[PDB]
Amino acid sequence: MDIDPYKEFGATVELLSFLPSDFFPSVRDLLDTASALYREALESPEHCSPHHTALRQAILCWGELMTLATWVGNNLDLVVNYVNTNMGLKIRQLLWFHISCLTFGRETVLEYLVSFGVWIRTPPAYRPPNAPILSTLMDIDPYKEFGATVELLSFLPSDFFPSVRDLLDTASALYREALESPEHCSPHHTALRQAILCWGELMTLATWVGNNLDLVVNYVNTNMGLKIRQLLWFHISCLTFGRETVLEYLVSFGVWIRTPPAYRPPNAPILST
Amino acid sequence: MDIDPYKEFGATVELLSFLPSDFFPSVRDLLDTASALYREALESPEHCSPHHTALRQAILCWGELMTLATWVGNNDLVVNYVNTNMGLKIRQLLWFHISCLTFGRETVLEYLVSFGVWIRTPPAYRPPNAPILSTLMDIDPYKEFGATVELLSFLPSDFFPSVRDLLDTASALYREALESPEHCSPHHTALRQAILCWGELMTLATWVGNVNYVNTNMGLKIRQLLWFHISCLTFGRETVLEYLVSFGVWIRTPPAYRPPNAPILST
Amino acid sequence: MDIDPYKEFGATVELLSFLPSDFFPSVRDLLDTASALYREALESPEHCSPHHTALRQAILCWGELMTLATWVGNNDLVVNYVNTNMGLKIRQLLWFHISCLTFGRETVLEYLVSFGVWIRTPPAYRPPNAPILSTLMDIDPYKEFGATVELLSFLPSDFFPSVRDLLDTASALYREALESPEHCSPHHTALRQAILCWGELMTLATWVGNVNYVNTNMGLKIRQLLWFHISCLTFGRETVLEYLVSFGVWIRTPPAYRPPNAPILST
């Protein structure tokens, strides 16, 4: 799947390439800006916007990118300036786009990307002195806006969830025409596009540790692979079975696992359509 | 899952830390006050209050702590540990529910603020009279819920899942209401006390291990309490009560006169 | 500009001089009483009272006094000076606002008159019980006003004028209401406490000078508080809050991608 993170919001990757690489603030400057203004809505049990759904996933994706980044530094700073060049640059553009579309409006940021493009394409002998400005003058749960918890997702066994290869094959076989659509179509589609993109960022970083500096691939499939297996399984199943069905299946299969085998139905529950 | 024993009753642990540890009457003095005033209601087939429910589980939890304490003294250094750690938290819980039954709940919350003002005062300006509250037993744990100990006595010991598996089912399904400042049911009140009763029972057992026969005497009793209140929240009370009737007919029937599959609780 | 900390709350300094200096509970005893009773309201995005506002600035001022006191002990003679002079005035301010939240404001003013009658009595006719009040934590200073510490963290250290220049702007524009016996706004209440907090901070610094790193740790924090409340009185709160948004976009933009002039707060 070639999924654009900006396509459902009316932008593309090449449209945000109009701003230079050093236009964007640091991740600390942007994560402080989100918590200064949207910390009560980014931790709300509501969707509230597609921009809030896409911002919650990018905040959790950077934490998993930085969990792997410090772990390689303990178990081999050459790893961390590669993250700031490749993965952290994509995080900074994605954080900047959603924070400023919340602050200023999505049409305003799309008008501004065009206006800054005309300004930066001007040669410096004819460029105006003032650039265009956009001025109008935190622990997140990935499942909370969908009615679940990390506690309810871990209520099921660790080895219950299918492989990350089988889930990306399922999303490609069933939702490739909608995950690559320029529409939102659901909050499940928004949270699933970011999960597919974030797994590509970690799989880019994990093979870079493997080629340059192979114990890291076992670690990412234990901690970050299990978290992406539950995240892919949750949103795929809520698309094909419904969100209320998957929430009741989590407490049906969970109590069935806890029940002694002599006093439960003999076969495991399953979701079927 | 961190449960406050007083959050549904308008207080906190930090509000009852205003009173000192030696303020509270002994367990024997508090159980006599309960027996003399509230015995036909604490042995009643009614709920009668959320205070009556929380007091019933607290009297029954002290009996399991004393049964565990009198055993490990046969197999007095431990009784100085029970009275300092587990007997003190029972004494705060027994005092709180007797006093909110005798004086009302808003009187005890107001008395907690007033005793805090008295205890924070330096002694040159603190009056000699401390504030006082003046202006106004065999318990079955299941009897207020329609069941009995004898009705649940037919379920074998391997029917129930682990205490860990029952504390995960409570936390994955009901944590939002077990840590709520509401009551929400008498099944939630009884479930809050049983989780804290297991926490007092476990810290005694890990301390005397520095032995796990508690998993056939006290852990079995906790497992039926944890099973009964989880199931009555999941399936409903009348569904669980009529399942316990039909399971008992099955388990009293000898083999070759019953179907080889036990009844299943669902739907 | 001489500000009475209790004039908007119906009292004076001379009325709280009826109580002796050793009457008041310790700072640790008073902060636990605030934490146990008023923490979801003292960490709330609401005002909820003028007493809640004055209590928030007093808890945050004691933290800056203790940060200044624990530094100069590394570079215990000063802690006997803080507890005698600055810790005593905090203890009167912490006691007054906790007690007017717990018992009401008219009860505390009546208790101050009654304790004065008791303390003036000669000891042969003074009763043994002193009068008592019986009948009924990480704070953000800007959170009740719509801002945060992180929102004001983008303004550089040279944005703000001097503490002297900010105390003259308050005195030349708002002295008639900062010395009034009214509240007039939550911005006036917070401004009264910050001017008195700087006075307690400065007398400690001139005493330990008989060193001015307070102008990059504590004077910087006072300068943002003095700037924010003066500007929200001058320009309005929503004008200042949307200026802080637009200034942050400007200061996060690197040079050669922003206009070379910062946004100006006016109109």
Residue numbers in the entry:
A (entry chain B): 1 to 76, 195 to 255, 285 to 360, 372 to 431
B (entry chain A), C (entry chain A): 1 to 75, 195 to 255, 285 to 358, 375 to 431
Give me lines lifted from the publication on this model.
We have developed a modified HBV core (HBcAg) VLP, termed VelcroVax, with surface expression of a SUMO-Affimer. The genetic fusion of two monomers results in a tandem HBcAg construct and the introduction of an anti-SUMO Affimer into the first MIR of this tandem construct forms the basis of our VLP capture system, VelcroVax.
Freshly purified VLPs were used for cryoEM data collection, and structures were determined for both T = 4 (at 2.9-Å resolution) and T = 3* (at 3.6-Å resolution) configurations. The T = 3* reconstruction was less well resolved than the T = 4 reconstruction, likely because 5-fold symmetry was imposed during refinement to account for the unique symmetrical arrangement of T = 3* particles. Both the T = 3* and T = 4 reconstructions had clearly resolved density for residues corresponding to the helices of both HBcAg molecules within the tandem VelcroVax sequence. Unsurprisingly, given the presence of flexible linking sequences, the SUMO-Affimer, the second MIR, and the internal Gly-Ser-linker lacked clearly defined density. The fact that each fused dimer could occupy one of two orientations, leading to four unique arrangements per asymmetric unit for the T = 4 particle, also likely contributed to the poorly defined density of these regions. Although the majority of the VLP was well resolved, density for the SUMO-Affimer was not evident in reconstructions of either T = 4 or T = 3* VelcroVax VLPs. In an attempt to resolve Affimer density, data for the T = 4 configuration of VelcroVax was subjected to symmetry expansion and focused 3D classification, using a mask to isolate the region above the four-helix bundle.
